[PDB]
Amino acid sequence: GIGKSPTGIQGFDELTLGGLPTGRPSLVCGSAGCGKTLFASTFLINGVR
Amino acid sequence: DLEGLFLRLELAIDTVGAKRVVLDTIESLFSNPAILRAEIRRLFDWLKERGLTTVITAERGDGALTRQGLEEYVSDCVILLDHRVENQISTRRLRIVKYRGTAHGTNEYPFLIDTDGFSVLPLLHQVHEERIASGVPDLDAMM
Amino acid sequence: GIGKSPTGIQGFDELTLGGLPTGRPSLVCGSAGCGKTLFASTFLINGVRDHGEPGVFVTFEERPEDIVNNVASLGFELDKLIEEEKIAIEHIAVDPSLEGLFLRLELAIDTVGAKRVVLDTIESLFSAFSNPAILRAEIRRLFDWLKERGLTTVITAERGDGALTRQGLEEYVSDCVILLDHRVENQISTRRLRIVKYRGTAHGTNEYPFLIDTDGFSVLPVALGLLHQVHEERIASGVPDLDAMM
Amino acid sequence: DWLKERGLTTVITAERGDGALTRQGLEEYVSDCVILLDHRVENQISTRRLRI
Amino acid sequence: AGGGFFRGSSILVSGVAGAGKSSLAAHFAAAACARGERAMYFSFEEAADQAVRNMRSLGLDLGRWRDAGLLRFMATRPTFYSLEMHLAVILREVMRFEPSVVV
Ligand SMILES: Nc1ncnc2c1ncn2[C@@H]1O[C@H](COP(=O)(O)OP(=O)(O)O)[C@@H](O)[C@H]1O
Ligand SMILES: Nc1ncnc2c1ncn2[C@@H]1O[C@H](COP(=O)(O)OP(=O)(O)O)[C@@H](O)[C@H]1O
Ligand SMILES: Nc1ncnc2c1ncn2[C@@H]1O[C@H](COP(=O)(O)OP(=O)(O)O)[C@@H](O)[C@H]1O
Numbered sequence: 001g002i003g004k005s006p007t008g009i010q011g012f013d014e015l016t017l018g019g020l021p022t023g024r025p026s027l028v029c030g031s032a033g034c035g036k037t038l039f040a041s042t043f044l045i046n047g048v049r
Numbered sequence: 050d051l052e053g054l055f056l057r058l059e060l061a062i063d064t065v066g067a068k069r070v071v072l073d074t075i076e077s078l079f080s081n082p083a084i085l086r087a088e089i090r091r092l093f094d095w096l097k098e099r100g101l102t103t104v105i106t107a108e109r110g111d112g113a114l115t116r117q118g119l120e121e122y123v124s125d126c127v128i129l130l131d132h133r134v135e136n137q138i139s140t141r142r143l144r145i146v147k148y149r150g151t152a153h154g155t156n157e158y159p160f161l162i163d164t165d166g167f168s169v170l171p172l173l174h175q176v177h178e179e180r181i182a183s184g185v186p187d188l189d190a191m192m
Numbered sequence: 193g194i195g196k197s198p199t200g201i202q203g204f205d206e207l208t209l210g211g212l213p214t215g216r217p218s219l220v221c222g223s224a225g226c227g228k229t230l231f232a233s234t235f236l237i238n239g240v241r242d243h244g245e246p247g248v249f250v251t252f253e254e255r256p257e258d259i260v261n262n263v264a265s266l267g268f269e270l271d272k273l274i275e276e277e278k279i280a281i282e283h284i285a286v287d288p289s290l291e292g293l294f295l296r297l298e299l300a301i302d303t304v305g306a307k308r309v310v311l312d313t314i315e316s317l318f319s320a321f322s323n324p325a326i327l328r329a330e331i332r333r334l335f336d337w338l339k340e341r342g343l344t345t346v347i348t349a350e351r352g353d354g355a356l357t358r359q360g361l362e363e364y365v366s367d368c369v370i371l372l373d374h375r376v377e378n379q380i381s382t383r384r385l386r387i388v389k390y391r392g393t394a395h396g397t398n399e400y401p402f403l404i405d406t407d408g409f410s411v412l413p414v415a416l417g418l419l420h421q422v423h424e425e426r427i428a429s430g431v432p433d434l435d436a437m438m
Numbered sequence: 439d440w441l442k443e444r445g446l447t448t449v450i451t452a453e454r455g456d457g458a459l460t461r462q463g464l465e466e467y468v469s470d471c472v473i474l475l476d477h478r479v480e481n482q483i484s485t486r487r488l489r490i
Numbered sequence: 491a492g493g494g495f496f497r498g499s500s501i502l503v504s505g506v507a508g509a510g511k512s513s514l515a516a517h518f519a520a521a522a523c524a525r526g527e528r529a530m531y532f533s534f535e536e537a538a539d540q541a542v543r544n545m546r547s548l549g550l551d552l553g554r555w556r557d558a559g560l561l562r563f564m565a566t567r568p569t570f571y572s573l574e575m576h577l578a579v580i581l582r583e584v585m586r587f588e589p590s591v592v593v
């Protein structure tokens with residue numbers, strides 16, 4: 001398979017089969033208020049904690 | 050100049066000794082497909098080289114995936130967030146347009162941004178073989 | 193008659209009645225996530241496996257390692273075929289600082305005995321800069337080069353702004369145009385394909401749903417109806433009274 | 439940024455139209471709190487809708 | 491009164507499931523084939539071998555006429571084509587067989 005880095009976001013991790021692709025570019029598209037910056041912030045903070 | 054970005058990036062990377070990288074409001078930094086496309090691919094290549102797991106913010110007010118319309122295709126993973134308001138209630142939804150190299154959930158999925166943070170709800174069970182009382186004696190004896 | 197070359201895709205080969213046109217170019221139009229690159233990977237790899245047809249995979253964006261990982265996670269053993277000297281990956285770039293493509297293609301073709309070719313994101317060259325007004329000329333140039341070489345071609349494309357192609361002319365320069373779609377009804381995603389155009393043969397003129405699984409790019413075969421088997425023997429129901437009732 | 443340094447709560451009012459859900463769309467991304475108002479007609483009666 | 495529906499006419503055979511409609515239709519077709527006329531049976535839910543064998547139970551050797559050539563059995567399903575395509579295919583086969591009775 002391929003390596004996955006869990007985002008700590010349950011449900012999302014199960015849907016991505018583990019997490020986002022490790023060491024790769026991933027885009028968080030959407031209009032204002034969708035939650036992109038917070039999604040990435042949680043990526044970082046969950047990876048840290 | 051494009052070297053200052055890498056100069057600032059490497060110090061921060063190695064200072065905290067991190068492997069996760071997040072980029073935000075890069076569309077404003079970009080502010081004619083050639084310049085944009087080329088610099089996008091260049092930066093992503095360098096991050097790959099350093100081995101950094103990258104998450105880039107993208108906004109798409111005008112278009113279906115990005116403001117410019119050509120930034121999305123360069124990435125390897127794509128995730129779209131939406132906030133619809135049919136009737137009057139509003140719901141927040143997430144979907145995976147593309148995720149090369151794996152299987153994922155193509156369907157849309159609702160999420161909530163409560164004080165806790167992102168939340169999403171993702172087929173059989175074993176059966177017990179003991180009986181329970183309904184509190185109504187005649188009904189529980191009817192079987 | 194019309195030349196044909198199967199993709200190894202059961203069902204799609206029924207739609208096309210033989211596969212994509214052999215020695216002729218085809219365009220797999222599709223937005224991001226539809227599975228154009230996977231369709232082309234299937235094309236080449238299954239052509240090598242089943243039909244003993246070697247091919248070359250020209251990528252204008254990603255790395256060969258990325259391609260190998262993407263197609264290998266499914267089950268396609270592409271690394272082995274690469275080192276078997278029967279398939280090749282060629283990486284090309286834009287903003288670096290016509291005959292180069294032909295020469296690299298000639299090297300790969302003579303190295304792997306190639307009859308099939310995939311062009312992934314030929315868009316790059318034309319889209320990065322639209323300053324030259326001879327874009328269609330360059331397109332048809334490479335197309336005529338491959339047609340002279342007698343090579344089957346599967347050009348991928350990008351369809352984000354709208355229409356069938358962002359270029360606007362590629363759909364009319366290709367012979368067989370396959371549109372891929374991945375729509376969301378209710379909150380459920382359905383993957384579809386359609387043979388928009390095929391020159392000189394009957395094809396499936398409607399949306400055939402397809403799926404991307406570990407088995408690969410799969411199409412439910414099409415038309416499995418009124419070809420029933422007529423048995424005169426009787427089947428037991430487990431209820432002898434019911435059985436006796438007839 | 440001048441305003442933020444000076445510590446002033448600013449309400450910036452802008453318009454929409456011209457075939458886009460906002461005049462420019464890039465001012466949204468600048469803002470920190472976006473409040474959209476709408477005057478929408480159903481049948482022959484209109485209503486006033488506010489959204490954040 | 492006259493002893494039979496008019497030659498060039500339309501007959502409706504309304505009923506519920508398991509009422510005998512297809513059987514009466516097959517009987518019309520078999521009587522035509524016996525008279526020597528050409529017949530066509532368009533089954534939109536039943537196979538040719540299947541229906542002919544089902545009619546064996548009513549003393550009808552539909553397969554005999556089908557082998558002779560005075561019966562053409564077209565088995566199809568609605569969801570396969572569009573309504574226009576169904577219409578066109580039906581008219582095509584009818585024009586090619588020049589039938590006298592059509593079910
Ligand atoms: N403390 C909080 N409580 C509830 N919701 C929050 C909180 N912080 C952020 N959010 C939600 O997360 C979203 C984050 O928006 P933001 O990331 O700034 O937009 P973008 O990054 O898409 O430009 C907002 O729409 C907001 O409703
Ligand atoms: N192992 C797998 N199982 C199921 N689907 C996969 C697998 N690997 C890749 N995919 C699918 O391939 C799609 C992207 O394919 P690709 O053609 O490479 O990208 P694009 O469609 O952007 O060109 C994704 O939507 C993903 O669902
Ligand atoms: N020999 C028989 N005796 C009694 N009933 C029969 C016999 N053969 C067939 N049937 C009945 O005829 C019915 C089938 O008729 P059919 O022409 O298939 O009607 P339809 O196609 O409109 O449902 C069944 O209900 C079956 O039980």
Ligand SMILES: [Mg+2]
Nearest residue numbers: 037038073467
């Ligand atoms: Mg923000």
Ligand SMILES: [Mg+2]
Nearest residue numbers: 149228229230
């Ligand atoms: Mg791809």
Ligand SMILES: [Mg+2]
Nearest residue numbers: 508511512535
């Ligand atoms: Mg019937």
